[PDB]
Design a protein around this ligand. Structure first.
Ligand SMILES: Nc1nc2c(ncn2[C@@H]2O[C@H](COP(=O)(O)OP(=O)(O)CP(=O)(O)O)[C@@H](O)[C@H]2O)c(=O)[nH]1
Ligand SMILES: [Mg+2]
Length: 514
């Protein structure tokens, strides 16, 4: 054959929509095994569109399209997410008799947060009776355009096809048109091989003679023979002996390609799936600062200290969250997605602010239950997996990873997150025109000596300065109690305003007033 370019194209959808029947139906045009438990890979070749010659590194050039057939069962969502990080376009498959099902929504949300283009595929069309057939498709079609109105796939194509007519042997319908649409729809990114080398491994096995082989998809950069790769899951660097692709051995490879690499033998079952990359370029983290955006279909709040499933790149782990927002002086401030500013203060938030117009950017502090090796600025997704609604809660960017395991002692002091406290108490007696003995606002943590000098305010409107305790505590009022207060059945309360920095001022016991 001739020279070719690979594009990875996923197949997503509900639990029985025909994703595997359609991936197979597409490869045979250009048997029926059970449900799908991990990413299935197959491919087909097609003449290269003239608009893609700018991406090529005898026969007419070809476009090879790797199908990435995903699972559909709901227990396996953490794989569907991993498969979306290796594709460019995605086919969402719809059981045309059933429309959007529970995982069709989840897979679309994934699509908005990972891939660039979408194609909707209405399958199981033989099920429809020919009389009410074409009339029904237009309803489902129009229902889909509406469903995609809000999203970034607003004008995405919608194709009808029957990947296996009749139940579980006729011929599959509408496949030559779907191959031609994918061909016109495929867009190709920059494909620049400069930067870090990163590769997602989907299969690993030993060949008794020549080492251990890893097939997978290059996400970043380039690699050539002789290079060394780190395998973080084993904490060992190995040398690249051999590389094959398109049934031929090669010497180099760049982002977007899918190949197999041969290295010195290790135990393959030690790295089933996972990442591989240029040595000492991924960082392991116990915690991280990541920007947060809520996902709308998630009927529910996002509460600080709640526990989520967090997908950091291609590895998911549990973590507890602590949200925060800009200093209210900077709600209108631009969102920053590539860095984190530590020269500013941040308002603690017991909950994410979902629409008092909300802020343009919010953040969080993920504290992982186990370390996570991951790239910088990767993509974070939160979810609630441990019904019949969206389980995907939020998404964002890994803006700053904390590699020290003592980040709480060693590094957090740099993060100016303050809680805004505002407490209420009563006044009892007056011991002078400038004294006042009020109380009933503090707790059994009567460390009142912690506040001896802080400004307080009374319902009358005079600025008291706290003194020592007497039980209960004393106050000074340099301005003299007001007449209205001297008379005082009315009561005349007090209010205190402090900022409690969660870690910053934490190193100490006293709070901040300003
Ligand atoms: N009647 C009819 N059934 C179809 C058609 N296409 C697929 N099916 C049925 O869909 C059922 C499940 O689809 P299958 O491809 O096996 O799995 P899937 O769609 O990838 C969903 P998962 O991978 O989670 O099992 C199959 O048993 C098959 O009989 C079709 O065109 N007409
Ligand atoms: Mg399947």
């Amino acid at each position: 054959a001739g020279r070719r370019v690979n594009v990875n194209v996923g197949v997503l959808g509900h639990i029985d929509s025909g994703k595997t029947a359609l991936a197979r139906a597409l490869s045979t045009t250009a048997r029926e095994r059970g449900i799908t438990l991990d990413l299935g890979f197959s491919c087909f070749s097609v003449p290269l569109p003239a608009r893609l010659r700018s991406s090529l590194p005898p026969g007419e050039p070809l476009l090879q399209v790797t199908l990435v057939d995903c699972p559909g069962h709901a227990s396996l969502i953490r794989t569907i997410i991993g498969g979306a990080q290796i594709i460019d376009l995605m086919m969402l498959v719809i059981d045309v008799t059933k429309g959007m099902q529970t995982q069709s929504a989840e897979c679309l949300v994934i699509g908005q947060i990972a891939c660039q283009k979408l194609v909707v595929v209405l399958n199981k069309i033989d099920l429809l009776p020919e009389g009410k057939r074409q009339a029904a498709i237009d309803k489902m079609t129009k229902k889909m355009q509406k469903t995609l109105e809000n999203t970034k796939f607003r004008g995405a194509p919608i194709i009808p096809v029957a990947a296996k007519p009749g139940g579980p042997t006729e011929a599959p319908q509408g496949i030559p048109e779907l191959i031609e649409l994918l061909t016109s729809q495929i867009s190709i990114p920059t494909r620049d091989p400069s930067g870090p080398f990163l590769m997602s491994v989907d299969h690993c096995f030993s060949i008794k003679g020549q080492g251990t082989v890893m097939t997978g998809t290059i996400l970043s950069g380039s690699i050539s023979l002789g290079d060394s790769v780190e395998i973080p899951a084993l904490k060992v660097v190995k040398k690249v002996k051999s590389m094959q692709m398109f049934h031929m051995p090669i010497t180099s490879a760049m982002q977007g390609d899918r190949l197999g690499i041969c290295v010195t033998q290790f135990d393959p079952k030690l790295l089933e799936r996972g990442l591989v990359c240029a040595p000492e370029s991924l960082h392991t983290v116990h915690a991280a600062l990541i920007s947060v955006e809520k996902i709308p279909y998630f009927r529910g709040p996002l509460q600080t200290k709640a526990k989520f499933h967090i997908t950091v790149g291609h590895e998911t782990v549990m973590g507890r969250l602590m949200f925060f927002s800009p200093a209210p002086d900077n709600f209108d401030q631009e969102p920053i997605l590539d860095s984190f500013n530590f020269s500013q203060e941040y308002l603690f938030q017991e909950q994410y602010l979902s629409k008092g117009h909300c802020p343009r950017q919010q953040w969080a502090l993920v504290e992982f239950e186990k370390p996570v090796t991951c790239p910088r600025l990767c993509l974070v997704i939160g979810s609630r997996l441990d019904t019949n609604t969206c389980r995907l809660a939020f998404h964002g960017i890994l803006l700053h990873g904390l590699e020290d395991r003592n980040y709480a002692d060693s590094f957090l002091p740099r993060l100016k997150v303050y809680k805004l406290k505002h407490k209420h108490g009563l006044v009892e007696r007056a011991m002078d025109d400038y004294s006042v003995i009020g109380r009933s606002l503090f707790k059994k943590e009567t460390n009142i000596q912690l506040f001896v000098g802080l400004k307080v305010h009374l319902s009358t409107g005079e600025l008291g300065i706290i003194d020592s305790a007497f039980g209960k505590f004393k106050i000074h009022i340099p301005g003299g109690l007001s007449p209205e207060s001297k008379k005082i059945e009315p009561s005349q309360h007090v209010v205190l305003s402090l900022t409690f920095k969660r870690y910053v001022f934490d190193t100490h016991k006293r709070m901040v007033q300003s």
